[PDB]
Symmetry: D2
Subunit: 212 residues, 4 copies
C-alpha cells in the first residue's frame, strides 16, 4: 500500500527563497511543501497508475468540486495524453460532484445531484485534491455506492498524516504530507492563493489577512 511521495516531519518544506512565489504572498506562507513542477511529475505518474487499473474501458471521471478543480483538470490532461496512443478511441465521461460548505466535514451537502444514476454500472474515478480527516470522502463513498457503480476508485493529490484521520486511504495518492494547513496549486483560502503555483503552508499573518 504505497502512501505516495512521503514528505516527512523531519524534512518537510523547502525554504521560501528557493522558489518563485508572488510578492503579495511574501509574508503569508511558512514553507513550500510541493513545488508546482513536482506536483505535475507526480500527477503524470498517477495518470499512468490510473490507466493500469482502469484503462481500455470508458470510465467516468468524477471531480469532487468544492473550491476548484485544478488537480482534476491536470490529472485529466495527463490521462487524456495517455489515451492518444490507444488503437481504439476510448470514450471518457467527465463529471463534477459539487459539495457545499471543517469540524463536521462528514456531513455532505451535494448541490449538483442530477442523473446520479449515470454512475450505475460504470467504472468511476473519484478525484479529490486533499484528504484530511477523511470523513467527507467516506460519506461521499456511501452516496456513490448506493447507485451501484461497476467500480469505484479514489485519487487524491494530498493525504494529510493526522491522528484526526478516520483511516480512509485512497487508491491513488500523490503526496502524504505533515499535519499542517496548506494552500496553493489547487487549494484556496477564502478565494486567496488561487495564483500560488505551489502547495505551501499558510502562515498566521496569512491566516489573519485572508480570513472570511
Amino acid at each position: 500500500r504505497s502512501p505516495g511521495v512521503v514528505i516527512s516531519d523531519d524534512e518537510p518544506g523547502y525554504d521560501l527563497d528557493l522558489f518563485c512565489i508572488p510578492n503579495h504572498y511574501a509574508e503569508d506562507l511558512e514553507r513550500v511543501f510541493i513545488p508546482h513542477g513536482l506536483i505535475m511529475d507526480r500527477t503524470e505518474r498517477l495518470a499512468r497508475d490510473v490507466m493500469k487499473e482502469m484503462g481500455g474501458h470508458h470510465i467516468v471521471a468524477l471531480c469532487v468540486l468544492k473550491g476548484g478543480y485544478k488537480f482534476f483538470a491536470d490529472l485529466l490532461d495527463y490521462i487524456k495524453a495517455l489515451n492518444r496512443n490507444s488503437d481504439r478511441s476510448i470514450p471518457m465521461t467527465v463529471d463534477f460532484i459539487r459539495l457545499k460548505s471543517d469540524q463536521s466535514t462528514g456531513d455532505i451537502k451535494v448541490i449538483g445531484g442530477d442523473d446520479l444514476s449515470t454512475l450505475t454500472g460504470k467504472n468511476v474515478l473519484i478525484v479529490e485534491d486533499i484528504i484530511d480527516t477523511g470523513k467527507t470522502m467516506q460519506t461521499l463513498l456511501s452516496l456513490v455506492r448506493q447507485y451501484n457503480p461497476k467500480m469505484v476508485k479514489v485519487a487524491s493529490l494530498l493525504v494529510k498524516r493526522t491522528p484526526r484521520s478516520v483511516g480512509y486511504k485512497p487508491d491513488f495518492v500523490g503526496f502524504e504530507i505533515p499535519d499542517k494547513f496548506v494552500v496553493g496549486y489547487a487549494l484556496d483560502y477564502n478565494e486567496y492563493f488561487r495564483d500560488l503555483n505551489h502547495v505551501c503552508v499558510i502562515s498566521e499573518t496569512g491566516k489573519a489577512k485572508y480570513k472570511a
Copy 2:
C-alpha cells in the same frame, strides 16, 4: 469589439497531415481549424483583455466547459501574480444541458448547478462555442436575475451562422466557418476529449461515435 481571429470560409484551417492527431481519429476528421498551441496563445491575449475591462466572479458552465475555463483562468492567474496586493478571484459554477427537439422549433435547456455570489459583482460568462446563441442568451437572463455590477461574455469560438441577434460576445477567441467542430473543449458523445486541436468532424466520425 474584436470579432477575434477570423478563420475564413476561403481555404479554412489546415490539412490533417500537418499536425499531430491521435491515430484512432485518422478517418474521423475533415480538417483542423485551430491547433492547440494557437488556442493557447489567443487565450493568453483574451485573459489580458478580460483584465482590462474587469471585483470579478468567473462563471464556468458545468460539464462541457471546464477545459477552456481552466486555461483562461490559468492565464488570468499568471497576470494576477505580479499585483501589489493579492486580489480575490471568485469562481462560480452552473450546470447547463441542451437537448435536441425533433418537433416544433422550441429550445430545451436544463439548468442544474446555486448562485449566491453574483450580486454587485462583475460577472464573466465563459462559453466554448456560440452557434445559435441560445446558451449565451440563457446564461445572460439567468445572470441578470441576480443583478450584477457588470456582465460580459467570453467565448473561445463563434460560428459564422445566422442567428436572432442577441448580445454579441465581448471576448471572442476565434470566428470560424459554419462547420461542426470537435476537439480541445468540444466532445462528440464523449469522444475527442483526447484531441487537443479544434477540427471538423467527418461523416465517418459522426457515424462511428453517434451514440
Copy 3:
C-alpha cells in the same frame, strides 16, 4: 513534396492586437505570421515525420548554430518524447555546427570544426531555423557530404517563398512563408527580439531602432 504549412501572400499575418506581444516591441513589428503555440504543434508533427524516416537508429542531430538554437532545442525535446516509448533505448548524438557572419550567404565560415569525421557512416539530421536563398544550406551540404554520412536529411522551421531561392528544398519544412523579413521565436535581429515568442515581420522603425 509537402511545402509545410503554407502561409499565403493573400492571408499571411494575424493582427498584432490579437496576440500577447511584449510592450517594448509595440511599434517594432508589422504582423504576426506564426504564434508560438502554432510553431510548437507543427514542430511536434515534424518530430514524428523525422522519426518515421530516421527512427529506431542512433542518428546525429546537428544544429546549424548562428544566432541561437531555440528551434533545435524544441524539435529535440519533441523527438526525445517520442523516443521514451521505444522498447530499446536509442542513443542520440547532439552536435552543433557554428557558422560565423547576407548577400554572399553561400560563403560559410565554420568555427567549431572538431572531429567532423564523427559524421562518417552516420544518420545525420541537420536542423536549420530559416532558409531564404538557400545558399548557406547547399554549401553546408557540400561540406557534410565530403565526410560521407550514411544519410543526410535537413529540417528547417521556415522556408521563404523567394524568387531569390536557388531551389534547395529541405526534407522537412515547418512553414512556407511570404518573402518578408521575420524575427521572433528563434530569430534575433542584432540580439533583439530574443524575448518575442512569435514569428513576426519586423517593421521599418524596428529595423532602424535595432540596427547594428
Copy 4:
C-alpha cells in the same frame, strides 16, 4: 550565497515507481534525485536571481550544456518581456570536452568553440554539474582572459564531494549527494537524453550503456 536546494545523504530523492520513467530505463537507475518539474521551478528562481545581480553575455558550454542553458534562458526571456525597453541579451558559445586520464593525475581539457563578445561585459558561465570543479576553473581562467566587467557561475548541480577549493558557484540549483547522475541535461555515452529527471545510474545501466 545559497548552497541551493539541498538534497541530503539521508533518504536521498525518491523511489523509481513514484515518477514516470521510460520503460527502457527500468533496470538502469537506482533512485530519482530531481524530477523534471522540480528542476524547472528552481531554474525559474535561478533566472530571477541572475537578473538581480546582473549588459549581460550568457555563455553556453557546447555540446553537453545546451539543455539547461536553453531552459535557464527561457525563464530569463520571460522576465525580460515586461521591461520598458527591449534590453539586448548576447548568447556566446564555447566547446569544452573532458577526457579521462588513466595515468598521473593530470586533467585533460580540449577547448574548441571564438570569444570576441566578452570584453567589458557581464559574463554568466552556465554549467550543468560541479564535481571536481575543474570545468568551472577552466571556464573561469578562459573568461578572465578577455577582461570581463563581471564574472558569475551558474550551475544546476553541485555534488557534495571534496575538491581543491576554487571559486564556489554563485547560482546553484541543487546540492546533491556524491553519486553519478544522468538525465535531464546529463547523458551516459549518448543514452538518457530522453530521461527528463535527474537520477542515479545503476550498475546495470553503466554496463549496458558503457561505450
